[PDB]
Write an enzyme that holds these catalytic residues in place. Sequence first.
Site, PDB file in Angstrom:
ATOM      1  CG  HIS A 113      13.141  -6.163   0.342  1.00  0.00           C
ATOM      2  ND1 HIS A 113      12.869  -5.183   1.234  1.00  0.00           N
ATOM      3  CD2 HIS A 113      11.967  -6.727   0.088  1.00  0.00           C
ATOM      4  CE1 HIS A 113      11.576  -5.207   1.467  1.00  0.00           C
ATOM      5  NE2 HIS A 113      10.930  -6.155   0.820  1.00  0.00           N
ATOM      6  CD  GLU A 114      11.424  -9.427  -2.636  1.00  0.00           C
ATOM      7  OE1 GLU A 114      10.582  -9.798  -1.817  1.00  0.00           O
ATOM      8  OE2 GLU A 114      11.489  -8.250  -2.979  1.00  0.00           O
ATOM      9  CG  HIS A 117       9.888 -10.657   2.457  1.00  0.00           C
ATOM     10  ND1 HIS A 117       9.252 -10.002   3.476  1.00  0.00           N
ATOM     11  CD2 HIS A 117      10.030  -9.723   1.490  1.00  0.00           C
ATOM     12  CE1 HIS A 117       9.025  -8.765   3.105  1.00  0.00           C
ATOM     13  NE2 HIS A 117       9.449  -8.560   1.875  1.00  0.00           N
ATOM     14  CG  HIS A 123       7.754  -4.834   4.311  1.00  0.00           C
ATOM     15  ND1 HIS A 123       6.634  -4.966   3.581  1.00  0.00           N
ATOM     16  CD2 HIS A 123       8.730  -5.407   3.566  1.00  0.00           C
ATOM     17  CE1 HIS A 123       6.893  -5.513   2.413  1.00  0.00           C
ATOM     18  NE2 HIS A 123       8.175  -5.820   2.393  1.00  0.00           N
TER      19      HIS A 123
HETATM   20  C1  LIG Z   1       9.795   0.689  -7.283  1.00  0.00           C
HETATM   21  N1  LIG Z   1       8.842  -0.073  -6.560  1.00  0.00           N
HETATM   22  C2  LIG Z   1       8.910  -0.166  -5.246  1.00  0.00           C
HETATM   23  O1  LIG Z   1       9.774   0.340  -4.499  1.00  0.00           O
HETATM   24  C3  LIG Z   1       7.832  -0.959  -4.653  1.00  0.00           C
HETATM   25  C4  LIG Z   1       6.899   0.084  -4.017  1.00  0.00           C
HETATM   26  C5  LIG Z   1       5.602  -0.464  -3.596  1.00  0.00           C
HETATM   27  C6  LIG Z   1       5.320  -0.745  -2.281  1.00  0.00           C
HETATM   28  C7  LIG Z   1       4.096  -1.266  -1.909  1.00  0.00           C
HETATM   29  C8  LIG Z   1       3.137  -1.523  -2.888  1.00  0.00           C
HETATM   30  C9  LIG Z   1       3.386  -1.286  -4.203  1.00  0.00           C
HETATM   31  C10 LIG Z   1       4.611  -0.742  -4.530  1.00  0.00           C
HETATM   32  N2  LIG Z   1       8.252  -1.910  -3.691  1.00  0.00           N
HETATM   33  C11 LIG Z   1       8.512  -3.214  -3.989  1.00  0.00           C
HETATM   34  O2  LIG Z   1       8.410  -3.618  -5.152  1.00  0.00           O
HETATM   35  C12 LIG Z   1       8.920  -4.149  -2.932  1.00  0.00           C
HETATM   36  C13 LIG Z   1       7.888  -5.301  -2.837  1.00  0.00           C
HETATM   37  C14 LIG Z   1       8.188  -6.175  -1.711  1.00  0.00           C
HETATM   38  O3  LIG Z   1       8.010  -5.717  -0.583  1.00  0.00           O
HETATM   39  N3  LIG Z   1       8.655  -7.418  -1.891  1.00  0.00           N
HETATM   40  O4  LIG Z   1       8.990  -8.237  -0.960  1.00  0.00           O
HETATM   41  C15 LIG Z   1      10.397  -4.592  -3.075  1.00  0.00           C
HETATM   42  C16 LIG Z   1      11.551  -3.575  -2.987  1.00  0.00           C
HETATM   43  C17 LIG Z   1      11.714  -3.076  -1.529  1.00  0.00           C
HETATM   44  C18 LIG Z   1      12.865  -4.282  -3.316  1.00  0.00           C
HETATM   45 ZN   LIG Z   2       9.071  -6.836   0.853  1.00  0.00          ZN
END
Ligand SMILES: CNC(=O)[C@H](Cc1ccccc1)NC(=O)[C@@H](CC(=O)NO)CC(C)C
Ligand SMILES: [Zn+2]
Length: 158
Positions: A113-114, A117, A123
């Site tokens: 996923h990273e 980006h 997204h």
């Molecule tokens: C268990 N935690 C999550 O699934 C959180 C949920 C979330 C989303 C928005 C705001 C706060 C939390 N998502 C992320 O950590 C993402 C942050 C991000 O997009 N990096 O590029 C990364 C995952 C998709 C791999």
């Molecule tokens: Zn992301």
Amino acid sequence: GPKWERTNLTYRIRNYTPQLSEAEVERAIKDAFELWSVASPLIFTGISQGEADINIAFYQRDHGDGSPFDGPNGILAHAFQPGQGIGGDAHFDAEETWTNTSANYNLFLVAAHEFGHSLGLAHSSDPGALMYPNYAFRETSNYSLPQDDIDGIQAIYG
Ligand SMILES: CNC(=O)[C@H](Cc1ccccc1)NC(=O)[C@@H](CC(=O)NO)CC(C)C
Ligand SMILES: [Zn+2]
Ligand SMILES: [Ca+2]
Ligand SMILES: [Zn+2]
């Protein structure tokens, strides 16, 4: 239109999480890049010393950018879009549990996923897409990029 103007990109793994061996870390990161490589003209190479286009690291809380980490769960990692300096880098919250199984959180799916980006993707609103903003375990075994992400990488680089 390319965010990255070159097709041969380098990466460097700055530090490691002690929760997995170093080889396990290197394979998850490599598998993560190859996913994007099979759908675009991009090729990824690891370097040991010097400047890399994509630096990868594990950090705790305040780590020098504007987005401090927040301990277990919550945000798992973040990445910057193509650019100079920090552009292309991927940061992982060192306070998470990192695995290579279905247990939270699988490094390979988080790094995949990273890296989207890192290459210029945003997204996705499709929950089956890797670029979706919420982590979900999908499998790993014969994991290949979901349809929406292929469309997204193809829309930028051919
Ligand atoms: C268990 N935690 C999550 O699934 C959180 C949920 C979330 C989303 C928005 C705001 C706060 C939390 N998502 C992320 O950590 C993402 C942050 C991000 O997009 N990096 O590029 C990364 C995952 C998709 C791999
Ligand atoms: Zn992301
Ligand atoms: Ca976190
Ligand atoms: Zn960061």
